[PDB]
Structures are given as C-alpha cells and as structure tokens.
Structure 1
Amino acid sequence: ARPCIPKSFGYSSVVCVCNATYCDSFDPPTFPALGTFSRYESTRSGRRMELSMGPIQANHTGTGLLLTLQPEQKFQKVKGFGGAMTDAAALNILALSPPAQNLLLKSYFSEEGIGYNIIRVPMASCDFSIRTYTYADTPDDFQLHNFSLPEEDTKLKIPLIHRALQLAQRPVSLLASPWTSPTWLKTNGAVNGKGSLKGQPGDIYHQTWARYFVKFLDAYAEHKLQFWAVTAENEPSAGLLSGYPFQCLGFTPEHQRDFIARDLGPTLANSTHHNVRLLMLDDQRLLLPHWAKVVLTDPEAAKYVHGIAVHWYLDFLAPAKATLGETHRLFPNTMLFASEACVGSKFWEQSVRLGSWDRGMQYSHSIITNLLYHVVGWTDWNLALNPEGGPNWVRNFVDSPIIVDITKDTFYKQPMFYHLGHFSKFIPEGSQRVGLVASQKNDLDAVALMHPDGSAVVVVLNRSSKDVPLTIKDPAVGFLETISPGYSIHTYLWHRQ
C-alpha cells in the first residue's frame, strides 16, 4: 500500500499524483473481525480512502441521528461499476510509459485499486475521438463486405481492454453503444446533424444496421472479447435535433420500439451472440417513463429488452422518483442501469478542474440517488482525459476521474476517482440494496447493501460543512458509533455473520 502524493492546482482539494514508479494503492482487502467494523474515509482536507476499524457495540443511548439497517427490506441486485474506454481515453493512457500505464489500469481494475467491473466500449467514433469513422464507410455496402475494425480498436481500445481484464480479479462486463451508423444508412447522409435511419423498420437499411451490431460482436470475438450487453443507440434523442454537432443517430421512441422488434432483436437472437443483452434508451432520464412505456408495452419489442440505460449530466438537477421511480413501478422486472455520467458544462468554469471536491461530491451523490431508485449499475464516461478535457473533435470537453499529463509522464487521480471508489471497491456484483431508515431528518446521503456473502456495506456522504455524529444500528450485531465530518465520504463494512 502506498499513500496519495497530494498536489494542489488551486481548487478545493488535492489530486493524487502518479507516475511510472509510484501510485497510491491498497493492500489486499480483508474482512473486519466479527464484532468490529472497517471504515474508509475520504475528505476535502486530503484523506483518501484511509482505513480504520472500530468496535460494534451492544448498546446505544442518546438522541443523535441513528440509521437503522433493514436487512429484510430487499431491493435491487447490483450489476457493477466502471467507465468508458473511448478513443480519447485509450490515446491518453497509451501515451504514458508502459509502467505508468499499468499503474493507471491497476488503479481502476485491480483489487489493489477500485475494482471496476464494467467497461463501456463505443462502436466506432464519438465526440471523444480524434476523427470520424464508422466500421463500414464504403457507400452502399449493404452486405457489410468492407466492415472492419480500425487501429483505434485493434491497437488502442482492444489491447487496453485485455490488460484491464487481466488485472481484474472480478469478472468484467463489457457494454457497447453506437453513436452513428454509416452515413449511407442515414436520411441526412452525415455523421452528425438531424437524421435517422432511411426507410422503415423491417427494411434493408434497418436490417443492415442490425447486422452491423452482429459484425461488431464477431470482430471483437475474433480478438477474444465478449460482451455482456449492447445499447440500442447512444442518446437517440440527439439525432432528432437540427445541427447536432457530433456523431448521432435519431430515433423517436416509436422508431426505437420498431427497430428492436423488427430488426435488432431477431437479428441478435439469430446469431451466435444471442446471449448478449440489449438495453434500450441509453439517454437522459428526463425521457422516462414515456420512452419505456412506448417500447415495453409492445411485447414484440419487450421480449428483446433486458434493461433501460440512463445518462445524467451532473451539472443539472434531478428528480429521480418521477423518472426512475415511476419506470420501476411500471416495469419492475426490467433493470435500470446508469450507462454514462459526467460533469463540466459549466460554463463559468473549466472542463477539467484538478482537485475539485465539489465534482467528486456530485458523483457520489448521484450514485446514492441512483441506488435509492432501483438502479443496478453506474458507469462513468471517459476513463481518462488530458488536462484540457480531451481530445474531443468538437471541443465538447468535460472532466474525468483520471487526468493524464503526457509531457510529465504522470496522471492525477481526482476526487471523483475516490468518490467512485467508495462504491466500486466495496459493492461487488450480486450485492443487494437493503433498507436504511434515518431516525430523524438530516443532511446526509446514505445507502446500505448486503454482499452476496451476507456482510454489510454502508456509504455515507456529507456534502455540508458540519460534522454530524451518528450511529448505524444493525439488529444482527449492534451499534456503530461514528462521526461523518463535513465534506467527507465514508464506506463502512462489517460482518453480520
């Protein structure tokens, strides 16, 4: 285990500086002895997932805030946590020297880092690309004779993905999403702008597009990568907007329904890759519950949909009950999954603010809200970006948890990285969210889950300046007496056994 090397860039908190020979890391995980609890703490003042242990006590008196575990109120099971291997992310990582590359990948994927188990993979180019390309740019190639993976896949994304999986203990799940089809499949004949697939679901354009998903999976399988899921389209609402500046493909919910029922569903089902799941929407949660109803109340589309993917832009405000809550109500057996999140918009400030505690707080707050409304996973955007928040061919720069400084052969772990890690490190696939009731109103954000083995995990975030004394009660074991300092985040772990 090595501790953070802090560096300030003049914002509210510090980054942790890594290079070819040094990066902060954890010792291997160990469970806390029965009758005791583990606490990991990060603070704006500079603590970074610092470990301590305390006793679980038999008794508690006093009128302080009490959060009581409700182990018999069981909600969703967790799919996992990760981020996106974009062209930008892969280019920045591979521009580091090999030992630094490995310390970066370890940070995210190893048990000695934060245990990511999801990687989102763009199907060809997006805004976080240095050029526009699809896998089938030969005009009118309906048989997809000229489908192929460029160097961006074979030389950047794919070798990094293999390395990530080799470092991970846990099985990693790959999720793919397209931004645009070939331009010759599109009404507007351009990668961006307003335009959808030509023709009507059922037809040659829609069939070719569905077979393009299959060719993609085939090509990745040639390189020994298999996918857990695909989305129907990244942000289908974007292709409905005039002058949309980067790669998109428009679908109304009805077009999405009919494409899935007529084309994508049957095509994937008839392929060797029929086990790959399909997620719909892959867009802002403001489009729910409407989009889910349109798609999922058609049994011919419904039978092909495993889940509903949501995005959020963190610089904007919620509210989750009406969108996430209502969708779960209507379709409780169709998982909700957060497939993309990012910060920076935003407007008076930079795309990358090195050391922003506030941006970290946005991540963990969003993650708790999502977990409180049935969401089974949360996936960050770009795994790594440069200090400008790119590259991005359209200059649509945003922040990332890891910022690579190629000229210095170094990378900075932002507070966002640790805010993410407080969840990803401590909530394996299979974990189930359970009840946690506050004895009184409070300023804390908290969530409780139980590991597949039975043990408990609680994350508590304090976005206020005031320290908050608190007790967590688990009837199986007793009381954890603790304090949540202002501008901190804690994860608590204990056996119930």
Structure 2
Amino acid sequence: EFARPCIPKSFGYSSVVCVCNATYCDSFDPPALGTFSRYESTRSGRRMELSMGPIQANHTGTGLLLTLQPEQKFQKVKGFGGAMTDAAALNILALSPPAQNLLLKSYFSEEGIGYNIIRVPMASCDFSIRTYTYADTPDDFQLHNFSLPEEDTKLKIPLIHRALQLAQRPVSLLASPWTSPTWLKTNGAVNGKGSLKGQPGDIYHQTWARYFVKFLDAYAEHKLQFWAVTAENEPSAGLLSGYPFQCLGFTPEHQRDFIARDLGPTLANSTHHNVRLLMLDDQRLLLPHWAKVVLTDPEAAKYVHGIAVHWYLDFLAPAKATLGETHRLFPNTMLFASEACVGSKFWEQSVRLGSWDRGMQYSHSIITNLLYHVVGWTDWNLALNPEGGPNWVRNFVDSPIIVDITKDTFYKQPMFYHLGHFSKFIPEGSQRVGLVASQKNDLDAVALMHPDGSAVVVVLNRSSKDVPLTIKDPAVGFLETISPGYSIHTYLWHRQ
C-alpha cells in the first residue's frame, strides 16, 4: 500500500511520538544495482525515512572508514519482537477494531516493522490485573483442574492469531512462567522468597514439568504452537526476601537438576519434543557462571538449546566478560535477549512520551548484543497505558506503543522506530559478519548478510556531533554518507 507519514506530537520530551487512531497510522510502501538504500530516524523527527545513494568504485580521504569483512561469519539471527502480557492485551483490545488492526500491523506486517517473535507469559505476572495460575486448585498433583482462563482464551490467544494472520514472515512464540501454583512452593505464595518444595526428580518437580506440557497442549488446542520455552522467568528473583512480583526461585544447581531430571525428559517425551528449551532467562551478569553449572552436566546439557538474558543489570556486566566469554566456552548454545524495557528503576519516570534517549537505549543494547553473538532481542510489553500499566504491583514501565483508551488513539515512540531499524531489515537467518573501523569513533554499528547474500548495516550515533563516514564493501564499492548527531540509520545493498 501507499506509505503514510508520521503525525508528530510533542509531549515536552526530547522528541516526538507518531499519533495513530482508528483511521490513520504511519506505514511503509511494500535498491537497483550499484545503489544503496538508507533508512534514517533522527531526534528532530525523521521516522525511518527512505533515501538512496550510489555505490562508488573508489574512495580517497582521511575520514572514518567502516570496512565490511563478509568472510568473517558469526551468529545467525532468530529474530525480534515483544511480549503479549495481559496488560498489553487489555490495552490493545481497549481500542476500536480498526485501531487495533493498525497497532498490530505496525508491529507484525511488512507495511510495519516485521516482528517475528511473541513472548507469552505462562499465567500471571506483574503485568496482569489479578494473580492466578493455570492450576490453583490446591494439591491437584494430577493437574485434573489445569485450565486456561479468559486472559488466555479471550485476550491473548485471539490477539496472537491476528498477529500471525497479519505477518508475512513466520512468527515464533516463546513461553515463560513467573510462578507455579502456590501449593508447589515452599512459601505458599505467588511472590516472595520461595522455590518448588522438595528436590528435582520428586513429585513436586514432576508435577511442575507436567504443567509446561499441559500449557503447550492447551495452546495447541487453540491452534498455537511454540518455538521455545524458558525454564523460569528470572529464577534468581525467588531467592530474594520479599521479592514483590510473581517468581519461583532456582539456584543454578537447582535449575541444572530440574532440567536434567524433570523438565528435559518430560518435554522430550511429549508431542512437544521439538519445542526448544532456554535456560537462565535472567540478568547477563549471571554468565558465564550459570552456563558452566548447567551445561557441564551432560544430563542437563542434552536438553538445553539456548540461554536467555534480560537487560536490567547490564551496567554491572560488560558484554565481553559475560556474553563473549559464554560464547567462547559454549559456542553451540545460542544466546538470546528475551526481555528489556526502560522506566523500571525506582527513580525513573515510567513513561516519557517521545523520549529519544529511550530509543537510543534500545538500539545501543541491540547492537551491543549482536556484536557479542546474541541471536535476537525481545521487548517486554507490546503496549501500555500512559501510566505504564496496568500492573497489580504498580511496577509501571515504558513501552514502544502507548494506548490512550478514552481517545481511541495510540502513540508510537522513538523506541518503536529504533527497534524497527533492526526488526524490519534483519530477517530470520541473517548472519552477522565482520565490520572494522579505521579510527576511534562514537558510533555503534553492526553488519549482517541476509539469507540472499545482500548486506545490511545499522549505525547509531551516540554523540551530538555529525560524523561523515564511508562504508567499504571489499570488491563491491564504497558508500559515502553522514551520520547526524543522535541519529540511527539502516543501510541495505545488493552485493551482486
């Protein structure tokens, strides 16, 4: 279809949001040889704007040069997306159906930014308006009274279907639990410090592993299948006195033994044996320690496909010492970023409508992650209200889309576009390749090759200063460009 431009609105922060409603949302149209395409977003308000340029045979000058190394091959990309929490579903469904469609297309359509991953909580988390699990009848070890409530069957499931219908690209679903039923837990509550009762290999752990199969059976009854599940959301959280949100504590040895004795075998012996299992699903500072504990046990390692990480304590955890070292030790176990959002520290404003800085936090993380072997990157809530909710613990945060229910309006923030500079232009199966710089610079940049062999480079300028630069593709040519202060650019070219 015809592209329609951003309707910009300022709320007094560093950049604009794009305003969408029942009848209008910004969108894309559905390069020739020896030309490149450039998509640009800026603080000043350009939103993924297309231009084109020539690929040159020669280059001279002393300016910054970024040189592709297409023969230095790294990880293959799984993809990008966000989470269908109860809060995200409530927000989306509060819009009239045509506005809902435009919000879903923004994310999932080729006319939008081409998301291909949806994270699905297994029952309630803090972004739910009530606490529940799928098996709250006490001591139901048989799981006879396991069932999906309306949060799944009326809210999440129909919206996931609609997302799949709108997507051209195959979409992968990823499930994560926050808490077990409370009668499986040491403390008998959905939150707080508490783990499963007993020990791996016992009735409580066998029941909890069966619950994952029951979940997958129930979604399959609604014609949804999962790419992957994680072994627990933030297992370390349930180790902490008073922890306020739904949780279930595991030490790395506890997770090791649960996977080996219970969760791995139980999944492998089900119709769902092709579903991937990811471990950790927690802060990357826990690496490489947690990978060493779990993956040096061959009974556990045989069931673990990958390692999921969250971004929240990245300031404690340089990527080289965590992601880089884990890759060096366990190169065959993919690293995957499974949850991120801004606005979640006690001192931060939950929602800052139009924040350019929060957009840059997303793209800087994604590039840093890609440069250290990570195969994909998942946002948290797909949409929230202007308060950053709803959330039963009032742990409000920011989201790339903010829904204004009384106005049948939604706002696409800088975060949406910064994510889209990756999701739209890096399909599943793309491969990160080498890229080196001729001098020290303030840019974050990453190069990948599409399944068809074409090139994609994303460049984020972290500084206020415009930086002229050249991209060298060896034996193909040079791109002469400029990266404006604060901007993010994606470059694409066919290498034939």
Confirm or deny: 8 A CA contact 1:314 1:341 kept in the other structure: no
Secondary structure at 1:104 match in 2: helix
Count of paired positions: 494
Secondary structure at 1:496 match in 2: coil
Secondary structure at 1:136 match in 2: coil
CA distance in 1: counterparts of 2:475 and 2:371, whole angstroms: 23
**Change in 2 beyond 3 A, CA 1:283/1:346:** closer
Confirm or deny: 8 A CA contact 1:202 1:262 kept in the other structure: yes
Deviation at 1:317, TM superposition (A): 5.7
CA distance in 1: counterparts of 2:346 and 2:90, whole angstroms: 26
Confirm or deny: 8 A CA contact 1:180 1:249 kept in the other structure: yes
Confirm or deny: 8 A CA contact 1:315 1:345 kept in the other structure: no
CA distance in 1: counterparts of 2:406 and 2:333, whole angstroms: 46
**Change in 2 beyond 3 A, CA 1:203/1:346:** closer
Deviation at 1:105, TM superposition (A): 0.1
Alignment of 1:371-390 (within 5 A): 371-390=370-389
CA distance in 2: counterparts of 1:93 and 1:347, whole angstroms: 26
Secondary structure at 1:153 match in 2: helix
TM-score (norm 2): 0.99
CA distance in 2: counterparts of 1:4 and 1:27, whole angstroms: 13
CA distance in 1: counterparts of 2:406 and 2:27, whole angstroms: 23
Secondary structure at 1:454 match in 2: coil
1:128 corresponds in structure 2 to: 127
Deviation at 1:71, TM superposition (A): 0.2
TM-score (norm 1): 0.99
Confirm or deny: 8 A CA contact 1:128 1:390 kept in the other structure: yes
Confirm or deny: 8 A CA contact 1:110 1:167 kept in the other structure: yes
Alignment root-mean-square deviation, CA:
0.9
Identical aligned residues as a percent: 100
Deviation at 1:349, TM superposition (A): 3.8
**Change in 2 beyond 3 A, CA 1:252/1:348:** closer
1:372-394 deviation line (CA, Å, top 9, x unaligned): 00000000000000000000100
CA distance in 2: counterparts of 1:42 and 1:8, whole angstroms: 16
Confirm or deny: 8 A CA contact 1:194 1:239 kept in the other structure: yes
Deviation at 1:246, TM superposition (A): 1.1
Secondary structure at 1:461 match in 2: strand
**Change in 2 beyond 3 A, CA 1:315/1:284:** closer
Secondary structure at 1:119 match in 2: strand
Deviation at 1:315, TM superposition (A): 8.2
1:272 corresponds in structure 2 to: 271
CA distance in 2: counterparts of 1:314 and 1:17, whole angstroms: 32
1:290-344 deviation line (CA, Å, top 9, x unaligned): 0000000000000000000000127846410000001001100000000001111
Deviation at 1:131, TM superposition (A): 0.4
1:27-52 deviation line (CA, Å, top 9, x unaligned): 109xxx11000000000000000000
Confirm or deny: 8 A CA contact 2:67 2:472 kept in the other structure: yes
Secondary structure at 1:51 match in 2: strand
CA distance in 2: counterparts of 1:316 and 1:15, whole angstroms: 28
1:163-202 deviation line (CA, Å, top 9, x unaligned): 0000000000000000000000001000000000001100
CA distance in 1: counterparts of 2:348 and 2:117, whole angstroms: 30
Deviation at 1:347, TM superposition (A): 4.4
**Change in 2 beyond 3 A, CA 1:201/1:349:** closer
Q: 1:11 aligns with which of 2, 10, 13?
A: 13
Give structure 1 stretches of 5+ with no counterpart.
none
Confirm or deny: 8 A CA contact 1:364 1:419 kept in the other structure: yes
Secondary structure at 1:342 match in 2: coil
Give structure 2 stretches of 5+ with no counterpart.
none
Deviation at 1:463, TM superposition (A): 1.4
Confirm or deny: 8 A CA contact 2:105 2:112 kept in the other structure: yes
Secondary structure at 2:316 match in 1: coil
Confirm or deny: 8 A CA contact 2:334 2:375 kept in the other structure: yes
Confirm or deny: 8 A CA contact 1:314 1:343 kept in the other structure: no
Deviation at 1:288, TM superposition (A): 0.6
Confirm or deny: 8 A CA contact 1:314 1:366 kept in the other structure: no
Deviation at 1:348, TM superposition (A): 4.3
CA distance in 1: counterparts of 2:153 and 2:346, whole angstroms: 36
CA distance in 1: counterparts of 2:155 and 2:192, whole angstroms: 28
CA distance in 1: counterparts of 2:282 and 2:395, whole angstroms: 17
Confirm or deny: 8 A CA contact 2:284 2:314 kept in the other structure: no
CA distance in 1: counterparts of 2:475 and 2:143, whole angstroms: 59
Deviation at 1:150, TM superposition (A): 0.3
Secondary structure at 2:416 match in 1: helix
CA distance in 2: counterparts of 1:203 and 1:288, whole angstroms: 28
CA distance in 1: counterparts of 2:92 and 2:405, whole angstroms: 9
CA distance in 2: counterparts of 1:22 and 1:305, whole angstroms: 44
CA distance in 2: counterparts of 1:409 and 1:35, whole angstroms: 45
Secondary structure at 2:337 match in 1: strand
Confirm or deny: 8 A CA contact 2:285 2:316 kept in the other structure: no
Which range is displaced more, 310-319 or 279-288?
310-319
CA distance in 1: counterparts of 2:266 and 2:105, whole angstroms: 37
CA distance in 2: counterparts of 1:3 and 1:317, whole angstroms: 40
Which range is displaced more, 336-345 or 89-98?
336-345
CA distance in 2: counterparts of 1:315 and 1:281, whole angstroms: 15
1:33-78 deviation line (CA, Å, top 9, x unaligned): 1100000000000000000000001111000000000000000000
Confirm or deny: 8 A CA contact 1:363 1:419 kept in the other structure: yes
1:135-181 deviation line (CA, Å, top 9, x unaligned): 00000000100000000000000000000000000000000000000
Confirm or deny: 8 A CA contact 2:327 2:373 kept in the other structure: yes
**Change in 2 beyond 3 A, CA 1:2/1:411:** same
Secondary structure at 1:493 match in 2: strand
1:441 corresponds in structure 2 to: 440
Confirm or deny: 8 A CA contact 2:39 2:490 kept in the other structure: yes
Confirm or deny: 8 A CA contact 1:426 1:457 kept in the other structure: yes
CA distance in 2: counterparts of 1:423 and 1:235, whole angstroms: 26
Confirm or deny: 8 A CA contact 1:315 1:343 kept in the other structure: no
CA distance in 1: counterparts of 2:468 and 2:29, whole angstroms: 29
| Regions of 4+ moved over 6 Å | none
CA distance in 1: counterparts of 2:397 and 2:87, whole angstroms: 12
Confirm or deny: 8 A CA contact 1:314 1:363 kept in the other structure: no
Confirm or deny: 8 A CA contact 1:66 1:470 kept in the other structure: yes
Secondary structure at 2:459 match in 1: strand
CA distance in 1: counterparts of 2:101 and 2:316, whole angstroms: 36
Deviation at 1:476, TM superposition (A): 3.2
Whether 1:404 aligns to 2:366 is no
Alignment of 1:9-88 (within 5 A): 9-28=11-30, 33-88=32-87
**Change in 2 beyond 3 A, CA 1:384/1:194:** same
Deviation at 1:345, TM superposition (A): 3.3
**Change in 2 beyond 3 A, CA 1:145/1:347:** closer
